[PDB]
Design a protein around this ligand. Structure first.
Ligand SMILES: Brc1cccc(-c2cc(NCc3ccncc3)n3nccc3n2)c1
Length: 290
C-alpha cells in the first residue's frame, strides 16, 4: 500500500477500487486491487492462484495482507475489451482479430479449467489487451475466494449479461461450462457489436436467453424442470436460427457458438475441444491498432 505510488484510479471493481500503481522501490507498473471484507479460506485460495500462470492469464504478482486489509498485485494491461469494442463500434473488430482473441481466451480457459479453477464472472471489462495482439483474462479464481455480490462496494450493479442459465436457475454447484457460456456471449457480442443478452434482472436475463435459444425443456436439458428456480409457468419461446442471431458469422463460427451456448452444461463444448474446432483452422494473431 505504501510500497506503491498510485498513478491513477482505473475504476471500481467487483471487490474494491482498482488502481494503476508503481512499485515505489522497484519502479514496476502494476494493477493494485483492494479487496473489501480477512478470512483464512480466502487467503489460502488466493495463494494457490499465484501458481496458476499462463500467457493468457493476467499474472498475480503478489498478495499483500496487512492491518486486516487485502491487496492483490497484478501485471498491468492498458486496455480492456469493453473499451476496445466501444472504440471500434463504427467498423467492428475485424473477424481475424475476433478469431485470434477467442482462440487465446479459450487457451486461458483450457489452462485454468485443467487445474479445476473457474472464473465465474467473465465479461469484457476483465478481458485485457496489449499492443502485441495478446488478450488475457483478469480476476480468474477470485469468485471462489470472495463470492460474487449483487452490487459492488460502490453499489454498481454486477452485470448478469454473461451469466450461464444454470446459475440463473439456481444450481448449487458450478462447472467450467459457466465460463464457456460467458465466453460464447462475448464472441457473439464482438461479432454483432451488440451484447447478446443484456438482462436487467434475473428473470429479464433468463427470458432474453429463452427468446433467442428456446425455453429449455427436458428434451434439450435433462433435469432442467427440477432445478430450484425453474417454473412450469415460464413462457415457451421457440429457438431462433443463429443465421439470424449472429448474421455475418460464418458456418464454422455459428457452429462453434451454438456448442458454446448449449443449455445442458454437460453437453456444452469444453475449452479444449473448442480449440480443435475447424473455426480455428486459419487463425492468426493480428496487431490491433489501439
Ligand atoms: Br474497474 C476494473 C474491473 C475489472 C478489471 C479491471 C482491470 C483493468 C486492468 N487494466 C485495463 C485498464 C487500465 C487502465 N484504464 C482502463 C482499463 N487491469 N490490468 C491488470 C488487472 C486489471 N484489471 C478493472
Amino acid at each position: 500500500m505504501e510500497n506503491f505510488q498510485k498513478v491513477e484510479k482505473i475504476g471500481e471493481g467487483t471487490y474494491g477500487v482498482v488502481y494503476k500503481a508503481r512499485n515505489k522501490l522497484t519502479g514496476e507498473v502494476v494493477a493494485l486491487k483492494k479487496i473489501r471484507l480477512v478470512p483464512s479460506t480466502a487467503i489460502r485460495e488466493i495463494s494457490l492462484l499465484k501458481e496458476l500462470n499462463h500467457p493468457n492469464i493476467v499474472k498475480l504478482l503478489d498478495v499483500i495482507h496487512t492491518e486486516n486489509k487485502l491487496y492483490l498485485v497484478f501485471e498491468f494491461l492498458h486496455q480492456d475489451l469493453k473499451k476496445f469494442m466501444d472504440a471500434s463500434a463504427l467498423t467492428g473488430i475485424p473477424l481475424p482479430l475476433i478469431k485470434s482473441y477467442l482462440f487465446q481466451l479459450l487457451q486461458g480457459l483450457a489452462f485454468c479449467h485443467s487445474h479445476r479453477v473457474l472464473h465465474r464472472d467473465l465479461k469484457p471489462q476483465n478481458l485485457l489487451i496489449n499492443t502485441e495482439g495478446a488478450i488475457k483474462l483478469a480476476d480468474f479464481g477470485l469468485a471462489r475466494a470472495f463470492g460474487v455480490p449483487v452490487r459492488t462496494y460502490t453499489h454498481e450493479v454486477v452485470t448478469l449479461w454473461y451469466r450461464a442459465p444454470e446459475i440463473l436457475l439456481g444450481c448449487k454447484y458450478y462447472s467450467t461450462a459457466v465460463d464457456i457460456w460467458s465466453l460464447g456471449c462475448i464472441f457473439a457480442e464482438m461479432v454483432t457489436r451488440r451484447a447478446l443478452f443484456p438482462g436487467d434482472s434475473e428473470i429479464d436475463q433468463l427470458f432474453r436467453i429463452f427468446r433467442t435459444l428456446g425455453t429449455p425443456d427436458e428434451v434439450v436439458w435433462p433435469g432442467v424442470t427440477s432445478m430450484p428456480d425453474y417454473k412450469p409457468s415460464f413462457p415457451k419461446w421457440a429457438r431462433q436460427d443463429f443465421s439470424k442471431v449472429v448474421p455475418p458469422l460464418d458456418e464454422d463460427g455459428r457452429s462453434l457458438l451454438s456448442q458454446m451456448l448449449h443449455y445442458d452444461p454437460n453437453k456444452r463444448i469444453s475449452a479444449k475441444a473448442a480449440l480443435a474446432h475447424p473455426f480455428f483452422q486459419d487463425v492468426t494473431k493480428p496487431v490491433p491498432h489501439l
